Design a protein around this ligand. Structure first.
Ligand SMILES: [Mg+2]
Ligand SMILES: [Mg+2]
Lengths: 244, 233, 240, 235, 222, 231, 250, 212
């Protein structure tokens, strides 16, 4: 019958590793680098677009940074199409929580459920896993500003600063060097860009090959604002830190 | 849940020394309208069984198809289909009885009263009743509808118990049945003059009689009856 | 539905998928359980290749299943969440029908049963997780420590360790733990647990987690400084 | 790979035959049947000294008149016992009586071949089912993952089974007392066990018409071990 | 609207002796004011020395007996030809009846036989499965006529020892099969006189250790 | 070789190897014999034990008052198929008040076995059956094979060394067929037939199993001291 | 019987490649060249009509398809896969949008729905990926004119101008030189015809070229009058004659 | 029907009548309205007969499966809740049930749970259920104390059923007594109301309205 053609996506190797999860992570390691840095008064999300063409429409484009709700955003590394499946699920889950409890969903609860979905594809169903790693940046009134990452295994962890995608080894070393706890948002903006600028496989880091976002309490009194940076705003912030 | 539309009236029957007789008129009533006149309500199964059906005619026609299909199915992979493994009256009845009770238990009955008359392979007379409720019973004489009220009293004067069966000939039995059919024509408002009669004998086999008529009727005394009491002319 | 029999017997009578799930447990961070006279202590390793972590929000290694029972583990982290969730649901379901919280043996038996079901069900792989389940039965002061594994077998332990380099720490516990006289106090039990982890860990900084469970739903997690004091005390006595 | 319910050229089911190899790796379990009762005994075999041996549950009650011992992948036995218990109680509910030991065993054995592509693989555990009923008296059954069961006067399963079975062949007779059978299980277990036999690494149990199925205490078994050693030294 | 139930009339009666038991029932079958059959038996030998009757709605009665007969058959297949004890049969029938709790078998059921000590046993059921062992039970259309007579003549209710000032009761004792059959015949002839649905014939099934015997007696046919 | 992974695959010469491997399980099974006259039909079965401490595996199963079989191969598969026959015999009784013909019993088993040889996932039954019965057309003996092939015979035998008994019955055909109105003589002929398949072992009191059905004889099985008469 | 293929036929290889997606892209590479250019007041999509036989009537085979009154699609790769995607895309525009909001979906969202369908063929049981890359041009009130590319993986990107299929590498280079942010629609049609002549080999006329625009509303193509707010479809397929007129002043 | 059960120093007393009626017709005088769930638990019949019978027999099967799995006696709370949760699933379907689940365990002590076909589950010290419950309540309330003796408690339960058997037309036949201890229930015999009434009338001096 059909047994002949089954890859058996949800099995262990003799060493106790999940083949397909390991290979999905290998896929993600070629994707454009994404960095998340958490400051005391906000969070920065920076991401490098995959080798851009000059005729690509830059302003009306979304590849890396997605909005889950008003308080939570994600940076993507891997297959975009896979990520959008998971993002729409995550968006619905947030609205289910708000409908039920009349309160915005705590960041960890959303992260856990999305990670639990990924886990399911590694244990049962015989389907390939989602070739996606997320960086979750969000805020709630319990833990304040929070950074998480999830990967195809469905395992998630919390971070002060983290990178996913390409050159995470080099990027994590640079973040570990210059990061400190009393850091501000504007400092974190500078760290994120400086790190990408050194780890990039491109010749020089320009505005048209980046997506940028901040989550501050920089609105008016005790409320959070999400800022998905426009092309011109990235051009200005790149000049302001002296990279171009 | 149903209501019967086109309906057939009494089916009457009895045992005699060598076999069984069964009869039923050829009418398909539509309420008080005597709509259809060519309706055969006795249906032979093989050369040893006759199923007599009263009640809803659409459901009767369904039952006809089932019996017809039963003969076909029995013949499959059966070299003795016309011998030892032929359909017995007892098999045909038990099948129908099962269906009637299953349908009532699903609150969607076949709105009928059925009498299965026949002769078994060992010569024994078979005569048993079943209806929409799945109720079953056997007796030397059996009848449905008005027949139960008017025919049975007449037929029980001939065969009142088991021991009267050997003492009853086919001539005496048929005479009683034909008389009962006349009485029903006098008194049942949903009966017709035309009827069919079937005899299943252990020696002479199945004799199916069509297009019989009620005859030798007494109507002459009607001319003397005037008014309803005090009227003379 | 995906039906494939993934867990199956081999010629020599082994179920390789279950045995390869044990290899995933062997890769996981070390976890240890030591029960004293009036308490149980669950110790857990945390690998130090991860700096820039946020320890406020990062999932803790020891999980409360109910107010009186805790569950630590070694192996795949994502897999452990599924077991913990089911265990937490069963805990509330038991309170709802029996009008009494689960015993530690019952909760263990349930978790072990789930693990077993995944070893002979179609379309699924076994859990790459072994657990240490510890706590106190309702209205009881006798300490309980149980261990489960991917195959589904479970058993009670005076002290036990699972995960990477667990054979080293099991060696330590086997000579240092006296059945006739278990750690009489909380301090003695925590120290023996920290000592055992120090055979394997590296540094006693933010690498060791300790959770103490006492009778009548009395569970508390130790902070860095509290644990560091045990590390400082043990090293000074060692230089002798 | 290959189908789960495939036949070998010799006419055997691969998966059933492979599960029998798993049972050979399991700890030893012995059962002896007498006219005074049936005795069940097992090797606990703790993997480490820190493991509390009294939590090792390899002898199990199904009903008051039926007991069970296991050997192999013991985790697989949980659902078999759960079925057996339900079958026993359910029959009591439907018929207001105890269920026959054979009827119980047959019910358990019906699960055995309900695998394929139902569960994904056969059970990796063999069972010794002992019990009593009014019709056939004291009985001992050996239930395999093949779906087959044999009645036995005495039977050993597990790693030391072929050596113990040869010993049971010589020692068993139709006039054995219960006390004689108890010692005989202890004797043969001590012979095939790796570690030295004591009350902590071996467990005894029995089923009698009068008192039903009882697992022996470690204190009771310890005396039977001491009684056994003295009798062997006495000649 | 279609009414799935009907009333086929008739009445039944079970009495238990020391080493025997009888289960009697008239042979008349009716609907409304018509007689369907003068001889339609409703007391059946079901094997294993168990006799059974399910009086009320005949279609349901026949269905139940048919199912129980089949239950006995499969008990033999599944439990090495073991004899089904009267107490086990009773419990099994409860599950048959209660299985249709929300669409009941419209029948008063009675079974008779010998218990495992060899003593006479009669069990009686309501339509939905409640059951109770008794020395005595009448069921069906004329149950209300026959039952108080049995209380008086079988269990000696309201009967005191003469001259004891109503202080000492008449002592309970087992009746002979001859004495029991007298009470059955008198019960049914009395019921036939005053109930229109009772008559035609009486069929008694007697159960001893030797097997199941039958006796038939004529009743009034009006 | 490459065409024996499952039952859904044909070999290049048009063979079904899984069905043939199932047929092989029957050859390993203990010998059982079937034979009939015009009045009675008899099953004789050599039972097999695990060792001297074990019981002897029961080979004969009752299906109805007028029908039953003996088995050779996987016993659980015989339990599945016998249970199916019990239901089919029973359906015929409840619905049609009719004893199931022994020929239809065979046709039903054939069709049940066939469905397992044409679908993915399933497997063929691993047992052979000898069905005897007495119906409206007298005594009958059938031979079921898990390929689906059912055959009506005067006598036959299946299992290990069944060729010996099958040859004997082929010689004795004219004699035993006319053993009418004599149960004990027809059994004696069957016991002598199965004896042609014995090697090193002989027929003992807890080894032999006999069953009989006939004109005025319900399907009944004889074991233990009841078969001592025929040794 | 029954679909026993409940497992993924597309899986990760050790190197991290999704083989079937890569192979689907290879099939797109083999396919005939198609392109899209975005102007200030409109969008143009075009492709060559590769005829299978001169006896075949190439008018009956439409490579450029209307999805909504303001959205059009063209492809490169396997035609049958494209045909069923158009059927599904048209339906999803109604079921998951128009039947809910009473208006047609904006380009980006319809594109997102088509991508979802193509992503599921990459992960679901017993199916291969779609062997096509789409170019979807469209207009809506709040986003204006837009042009999107959709690949077998389900990934989609917005473009100012692009080309896919046989000679896409050379065509994209040609478009980079010619494209500016001040292009009028007529200028974009002119550039589209120039770019397409490079990849086409045989005949180059209105019968061998298929070309449609997303431009001004067309009241004459609406089919009815009386509702002021309904002004007609912005999608229009250029006729064989209309193409030849522009090929003279080329 | 009349059934009662009350907690006291010596455990629980359970007392029930024996009559069963179908309208005015007395169907049985010898009915068993106490179910022996297991040697440590008892249950009472009121309302539907087959239901009480069927489902409390079933309850005993669930209690047996509990102590096989948990190696420990089932609590009265847990046992009563198994039944109440079951009937709650059937709520609306037409089950008729009013029962006292009575038992004596180590952790709980003597415990009585009133369970209902409406889904009601109430723990309590005194309960009376049936057509003649009000008559039984009158005797119980005026004579109940926690420090009754096993002998006096048994009599109080017997006398309270007698009270109801007399006045309530749908109660009578005979009185069945039980006494529930920690080591299990103890049956205290069947007492015919016909004989008991005259016995009580004379010895107690009560029922002076009635001529004897
Ligand atoms: Mg009359
Ligand atoms: Mg009263």
């Amino acid at each position: 019958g059909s047994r002949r053609y089954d890859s058996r996506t949800t099995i262990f190797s003799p060493e106790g590793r999940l083949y397909q999860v390991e290979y999905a992570l290998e896929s993600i390691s070629h994707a454009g680098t994404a960095i998340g840095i958490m400051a005391s008064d906000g969070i920065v999300l920076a991401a490098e677009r995959k080798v851009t063409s000059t005729l690509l429409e830059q302003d009306t484009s979304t590849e890396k940074l997605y909005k889950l709700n008003d308080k939570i955003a994600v940076a993507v590394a891997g297959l975009t199409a896979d990520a959008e499946i998971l993002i729409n699920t995550a968006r619905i889950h947030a609205q289910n929580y708000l409908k039920t409890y009349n309160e915005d969903i705590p960041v960890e609860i959303l992260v856990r459920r999305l990670s639990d979905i990924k886990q399911g594809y590694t244990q049962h169903g015989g389907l390939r896993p989602f070739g996606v790693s997320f960086i979750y940046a969000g805020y709630d009134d319990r833990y304040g500003y929070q950074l998480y990452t999830s990967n195809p295994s469905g395992n998630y962890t919390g971070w002060k600063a983290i990178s996913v995608g390409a050159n995470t080894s080099a990027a994590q070393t640079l973040l570990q060097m210059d990061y400190k706890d009393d850091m501000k948002v504007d400092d974190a903006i500078e760290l994120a860009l400086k790190t990408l600028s050194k780890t990039t496989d491109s010749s020089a880091l320009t505005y048209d090959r980046l997506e940028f976002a901040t989550i501050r309490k920089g609105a008016n009194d005790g409320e959070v604002y999400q800022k998905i940076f426009k092309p011109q705003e990235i051009k200005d912030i790149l000049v302001k830190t002296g990279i171009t | 849940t149903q209501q019967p539309i086109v309906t057939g009236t009494s089916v009457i029957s009895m045992k005699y020394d060598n076999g069984v007789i069964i009869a039923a008129d050829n009418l398909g009533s539509y309420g008080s309208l005597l709509r259809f006149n060519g309706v055969e309500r006795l249906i032979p199964v093989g050369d040893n069984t006759v199923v007599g059906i009263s009640g809803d005619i659409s459901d009767m026609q369904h039952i006809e198809r089932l019996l017809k299909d039963l003969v076909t199915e029995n013949a499959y992979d059966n070299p003795l289909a016309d011998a030892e493994e032929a359909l017995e009256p007892s098999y045909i009845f038990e099948y129908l009885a099962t269906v009637m009770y299953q349908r009532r238990s699903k609150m969607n009955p076949l709105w009928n009263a059925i009498i299965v008359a026949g002769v078994q392979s060992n010569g024994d007379q078979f005569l048993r009743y079943v209806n929409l409720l799945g109720v079953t019973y056997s007796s030397p004489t059996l009848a449905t509808g008005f027949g139960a009220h008017m025919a049975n009293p007449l037929l029980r004067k001939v065969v009142d118990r088991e021991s009267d069966i050997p003492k009853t000939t086919v001539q005496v039995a048929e005479e009683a049945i034909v008389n009962a059919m006349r009485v029903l024509y006098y008194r049942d408002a949903r009966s017709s003059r035309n009827f069919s009669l079937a005899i299943i004998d252990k020696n002479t086999g199945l004799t199916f009689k069509k297009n019989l008529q009620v005859e030798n009727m007494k109507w002459d005394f009607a001319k003397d009856i005037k008014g309803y009491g005090t009227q003379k002319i | 539905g995906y039906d494939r029999a993934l867990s199956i017997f081999s010629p020599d009578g082994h179920i390789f998928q279950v045995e390869y799930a044990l290899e995933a447990v062997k890769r996981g961070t070390c976890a240890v359980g030591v029960k004293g006279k009036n308490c149980v202590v669950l110790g857990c390793e945390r690998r130090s290749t991860l700096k820039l972590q946020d320890t406020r929000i990062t999932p803790s290694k020891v999980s409360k299943i109910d107010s009186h029972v805790v569950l630590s583990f070694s192996g795949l982290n994502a897999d452990s969440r599924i077991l913990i969730e089911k265990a937490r649901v069963e805990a509330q379901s038991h309170r709802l029908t029996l009008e009494d919280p689960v015993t530690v043996e019952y909760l263990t038996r349930y978790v072990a049963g789930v693990q077993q079901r995944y070893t002979q069900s179609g379309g699924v792989r076994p859990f790459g997780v072994s657990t240490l389940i510890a706590g106190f039965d309702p209205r009881d002061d006798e300490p309980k420590l149980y261990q489960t594994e991917p195959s589904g077998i479970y058993s009670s332990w005076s002290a036990q360790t699972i995960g990477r380099n667990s054979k080293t720490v099991r060696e330590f516990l086997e000579k240092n733990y006296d059945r006739k006289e278990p750690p009489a106090t909380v301090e003695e039990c925590v120290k023996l647990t920290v000592r055992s982890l120090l055979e394997v860990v590296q540094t006693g900084a933010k690498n060791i987690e300790i959770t103490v469970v006492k009778p009548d739903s009395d569970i508390v997690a130790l902070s860095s400084e509290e644990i560091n004091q045990y590390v400082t005390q043990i090293e000074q006595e060692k230089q002798e | 790979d290959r189908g789960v319910s495939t036949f070998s050229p010799e006419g055997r089911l691969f998966q059933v035959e492979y599960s029998l190899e798993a049972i050979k790796l399991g700890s030893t379990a012995i059962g002896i049947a007498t006219k005074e009762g049936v005795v069940l005994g097992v090797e606990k075999r703790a993997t480490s000294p820190l493991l509390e041996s009294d939590s090792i549950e390899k002898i199990v009650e199904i009903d008051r008149h039926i007991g069970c011992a296991m050997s192999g992948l013991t985790a697989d036995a949980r659902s078999m016992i759960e079925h057996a218990r339900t079958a026993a109680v359910t029959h009591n509910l439907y018929y207001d009586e105890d269920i026959n030991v054979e009827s119980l065993t047959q019910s358990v054995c019906d699960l055995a071949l309900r695998f394929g592509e139902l569960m994904s693989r056969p059970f990796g555990v063999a069972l010794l089912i002992a019990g009593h009923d009014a019709d056939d008296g004291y009985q001992l059954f050996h239930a395999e993952p093949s779906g087959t069961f044999y009645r036995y006067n005495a039977k050993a399963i597990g790693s030391g089974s072929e050596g113990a079975q040869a010993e049971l062949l010589n020692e068993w007779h139709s006039s054995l007392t219960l006390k004689e059978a108890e010692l005989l299980v202890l004797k043969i277990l001590k012979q095939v066990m790796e570690e030295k036999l004591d009350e902590n690494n071996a467990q005894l149990s029995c089923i009698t018409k009068q008192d039903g199925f009882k697992i022996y205490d470690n204190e009771k078994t310890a005396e039977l071990i001491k009684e056994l050693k003295e009798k062997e030294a006495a000649e | 609207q279609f009414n799935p139930y009907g009333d086929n009339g008739g009445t039944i009666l079970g009495i238990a002796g020391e080493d025997f038991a009888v289960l009697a029932g008239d042979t008349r079958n009716i609907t409304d004011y018509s007689i369907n059959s003068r001889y339609e038996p409703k007391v059946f030998d079901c094997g294993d020395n168990i006799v059974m009757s399910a009086n009320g709605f005949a279609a349901d009665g026949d269905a139940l007996v048919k199912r129980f007969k089949n239950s006995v058959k499969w008990y033999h297949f599944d439990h090495n030809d073991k004899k089904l004890s009267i107490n086990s049969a009773a419990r099994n029938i409860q599950h048959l009846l209660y299985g249709k709790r929300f669409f009941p078998y419209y029948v008063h059921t009675i079974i008779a036989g010998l218990d495992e000590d060899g003593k006479g046993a009669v069990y009686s059921f309501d339509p939905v499965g409640s059951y109770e062992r008794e020395q005595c039970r009448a069921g069906g259309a004329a149950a209300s006529l026959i039952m108080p007579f049995l209380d008086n003549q079988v269990n000696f209710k309201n009967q005191y020892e003469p001259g004891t000032n109503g202080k000492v009761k008449k002592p309970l004792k087992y009746l002979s099969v001859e004495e029991v059959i007298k009470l059955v015949r008198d019960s049914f002839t009395s019921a036939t006189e005053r109930h229109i649905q009772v008559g035609d014939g009486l069929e008694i099934l007697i159960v001893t250790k030797d097997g199941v015997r039958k006796e038939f007696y004529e009743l009034k046919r009006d | 070789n490459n065409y024996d992974g499952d039952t859904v695959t044909f070999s290049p010469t048009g063979r079904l190897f899984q069905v043939e491997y199932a047929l092989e399980a029957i050859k390993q099974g203990s010998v059982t014999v079937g034979l009939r006259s015009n009045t009675h039909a008899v099953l004789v079965a050599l039972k097999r034990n695990a060792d001297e401490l074990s019981s002897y595996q029961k080979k004969i199963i009752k299906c109805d008052e007028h029908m039953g079989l003996s088995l050779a191969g996987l016993a659980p598969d015989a339990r599945v198929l016998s249970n199916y026959l019990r239901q089919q015999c029973n359906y015929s009784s409840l619905v049609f008040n009719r004893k199931l013909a022994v020929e239809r019993a065979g046709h039903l088993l054939c069709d049940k076995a066939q469905k397992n040889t044409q679908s993915y996932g399933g497997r063929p039954y691993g047992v052979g059956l000898l069905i005897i019965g007495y119906d409206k057309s007298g005594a009958h003996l059938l031979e079921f094979q898990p390929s689906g092939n059912v055959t009506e015979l005067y006598g036959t035998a299946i299992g290990a060394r069944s060729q010996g008994a099958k040859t004997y019955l082929e010689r004795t055909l004219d004699t035993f067929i006319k053993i009418d109105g004599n149960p004990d003589e027809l059994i004696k002929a069957g016991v002598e037939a199965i004896s042609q398949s014995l090697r090193d072992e002989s027929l003992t009191v807890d080894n032999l199993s006999i069953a009989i059905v006939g004109k005025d004889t319900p399907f009944t099985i004889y074991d233990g001291e009841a078969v001592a008469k025929y040794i | 019987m029954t679909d026993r293929y409940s497992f993924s036929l597309t899986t990760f290889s050790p190197s991290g490649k999704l083989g079937q997606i890569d192979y689907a892209l290879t099939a797109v590479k083999q396919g005939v060249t198609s392109l899209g250019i975005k102007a200030t007041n409109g969008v143009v999509i075009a492709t060559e009509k590769k005829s299978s036989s001169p006896l075949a009537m190439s008018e009956t085979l439409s490579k450029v398809s209307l999805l909504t009154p303001d959205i059009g699609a063209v492809y490169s790769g396997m035609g049958p896969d494209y045909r069923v995607l158009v059927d599904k895309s048209r339906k999803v525009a109604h079921t998951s949008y128009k039947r809910i909001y009473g208006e047609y979906p904006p380009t980006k969202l319809l594109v997102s729905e088509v991508a979802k369908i193509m992503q599921e063929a990459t992960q679901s049981g017993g199916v291969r990926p779609f062997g096509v890359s789409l170019l979807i041009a469209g207009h809506d009130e709040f986003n204006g004119f837009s042009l999107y590319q959709v690949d077998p993986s389900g990934s989609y990107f917005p473009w100012k101008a692009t080309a896919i299929g046989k000679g896409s590498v050379a065509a994209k280079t040609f478009l980079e030189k010619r494209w500016n942010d001040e292009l009028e629609l007529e200028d974009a049609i002119h550039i589209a015809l120039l770019t397409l002549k490079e990849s086409v080999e045989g005949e180059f006329n209105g019968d061998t070229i298929e070309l449609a625009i997303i431009g001004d509303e067309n009241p004459d193509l609406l089919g009815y009058t009386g509702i002021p707010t309904d002004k007609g479809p912005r999608f229009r397929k250029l006729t064989s004659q209309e193409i030849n007129d522009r090929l003279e002043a080329l | 029907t009349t059934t009662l059960a009350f907690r006291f120093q010596g455990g629980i007393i359970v007392a029930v009548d024996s009559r069963a009626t179908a309208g005015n017709w007395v169907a049985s005088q010898t009915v068993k309205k106490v179910i022996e769930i297991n040697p440590f638990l008892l249950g009472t019949m009121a309302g539907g007969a087959a239901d009480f019978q069927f489902w409390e027999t079933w309850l005993g099967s669930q209690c047996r499966l509990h102590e096989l799995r948990e190696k420990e006696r089932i609590s009265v709370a847990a046992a009563s809740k198994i039944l109440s949760n079951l009937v709650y699933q059937y709520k609306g379907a037409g089950l008729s049930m009013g029962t006292m689940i009575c038992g004596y365990t180590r952790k709980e002590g003597p415990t009585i749970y009133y369970v209902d076909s409406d889904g009601t589950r109430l723990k309590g010290d005194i309960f009376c259920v049936g057509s003649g419950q009000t008559f039984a309540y009158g005797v119980l309330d005026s004579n109940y104390k926690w420090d009754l003796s096993v002998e006096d408690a048994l009599y109080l339960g017997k006398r309270s059923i007698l009270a109801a058997a007399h006045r309530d037309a749908y109660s009578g036949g005979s009185v069945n007594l039980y006494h529930v201890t920690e080591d299990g229930w103890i049956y205290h015999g069947n007492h015919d109301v016909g004989e008991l009434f005259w016995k009580v009338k004379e010895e107690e001096g009560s029922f002076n309205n009635v001529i004897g």
